[PDB]
Design a protein around this ligand. Structure first.
Ligand SMILES: [Zn+2]
Ligand SMILES: [Zn+2]
Lengths: 81, 81
């Protein structure tokens, strides 16, 4: 019950709930809480939350959650990120 | 949402909810209702209820639910059935 799988635009991003729980107040912080099945899109057959967003930049967002420093991917426009 | 899978001792018995809903008051009748996830053993990963019983005779119990006539399997003792 420590692992959580985010399905962002069809790409499965997997992480521990502690990682999401680091940065409070943000959307993924609300994901990490146990009252998240009702709040967010979720299918119990695969145990994944689905967000209809660009996955390539969510990699860097989740990297912010993991390491603690926010960086900009040099392969997307400024406004996109 | 019309199909329901019963896992009886490791053998998957599949049926429609109407079939279970035919005979009221019995255990499978309570299974057919929408408030059955909490009442009974159930895992959302496979969407199956698990009962730790002999499956070979549950075949005949479910056949009672389907056809409407209760028969005894001639391959098990009287007290077992
Ligand atoms: Zn641009
Ligand atoms: Zn016997």
């Amino acid at each position: 019950s420590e692992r959580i799988v985010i399905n962002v635009g069809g790409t499965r991003h997997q992480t521990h709930r502690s990682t999401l729980r680091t940065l409070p107040g943000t959307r993924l912080a609300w994901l990490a809480e146990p009252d998240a099945h009702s709040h967010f899109d979720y299918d119990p057959r695969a145990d994944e939350f689905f967000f209809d967003r660009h996955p390539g930049v969510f990699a860097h967002i989740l990297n912010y959650y993991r390491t603690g420093k926010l960086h900009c991917p040099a392969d997307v426009c400024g406004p996109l990120y």
